[PDB]
Design a protein around this ligand. Structure first.
Ligand SMILES: [Ca+2]
Length: 279
């Protein structure tokens, strides 16, 4: 399949080269997988999700996204126009308030919840978690992400936006998960991206067009935005029979575009997510 005039980040993940604007992919497009978007919430009634999205849990008075950030991440995972895996099921877990803030104890409970709830959903091709959140180092937070990954979910987490070594942020710094940094459309590491030994992969995260609340759209940047490109890719690749939740991260890193990013600090992987799709 080919989607012409795609967002730059979708085109980038099916290209050997920067500078093209058509997203190629296998039509199965994540059918039978499911992605949990653990964040501010998802506006499931936004036309771009076509009934494939639903809130499953909140820790606040409402399940509604009053922020936008979770709907945007959800859109890159699996909105019809702005998403990677356009036939996935999305589920939404509101662990963050409408100002984008959350306590670590609620963040940990949301991870626990997802580890169990995957047994109440029909996700034959597997389950991915997308975590566009974090903060200063916490072993309990890392331990929860580790538990979530061990249970059989493919965990993708944002490296953080401090232009710093990610070893001092959680769950960024947990070696068992897939830690994702961001690039721009010129194949440079994004200026704010974290880095270091613990990063697995880069994805597009500068000037990322996606769904927003109010049935709207906007273009925003962050390691928050890079993360759901890898999640949808993992959803996509699991539906294709190419890998499993335990192996997904490793398979993405091994089949990535190599050595094409500039602005890479010594000791950081120069690897960019790529679907390997040959029409
Ligand atoms: Ca890993």
């Amino acid at each position: 399949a080919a989607q012409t005039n795609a967002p730059w980040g979708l085109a980038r993940i099916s290209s050997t080269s920067p500078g093209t604007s058509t997203y190629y992919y296998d039509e199965s497009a994540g059918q039978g997988s499911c992605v949990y978007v653990i964040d501010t919430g998802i506006e499931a009634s936004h036309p771009e999700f076509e009934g494939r999205a639903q809130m499953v849990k909140t820790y606040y008075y409402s399940s509604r996204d009053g922020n936008g950030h979770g709907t945007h991440c959800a859109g890159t995972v699996g909105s019809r126009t702005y998403g990677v895996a356009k036939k996935t099921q999305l589920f939404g877990v509101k662990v963050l308030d409408d100002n984008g803030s959350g306590q670590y104890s609620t963040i940990i409970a949301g991870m626990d919840f997802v580890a169990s709830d995957k047994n109440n959903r029909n996700c034959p091709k597997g389950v991915v978690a997308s975590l566009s959140l974090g903060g200063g180092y916490s072993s309990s937070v890392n331990s929860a992400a580790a538990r979530l990954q061990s249970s059989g979910v493919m965990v993708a987490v944002a490296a953080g936006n401090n232009n710093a070594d990610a070893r001092n942020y959680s769950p960024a710094s947990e070696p068992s998960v897939c830690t994702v940094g961001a690039s721009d459309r010129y194949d440079r590491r994004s200026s704010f991206s974290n880095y270091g030994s613990v990063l697995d992969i880069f994805g597009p995260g500068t000037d990322i067009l996606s769904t927003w609340i109010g049935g709207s759209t906007r273009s925003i940047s962050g390691t928050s935005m890079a993360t759901p490109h890898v999640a949808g890719l993992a959803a996509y690749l699991m539906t294709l029979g190419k890998t499993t939740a335990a192996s997904a991260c490793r398979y993405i890193a091994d089949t990535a575009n190599k050595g094409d990013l500039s602005n890479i600090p010594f000791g950081t992987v120069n690897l960019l997510a790529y679907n390997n799709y040959q029409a």
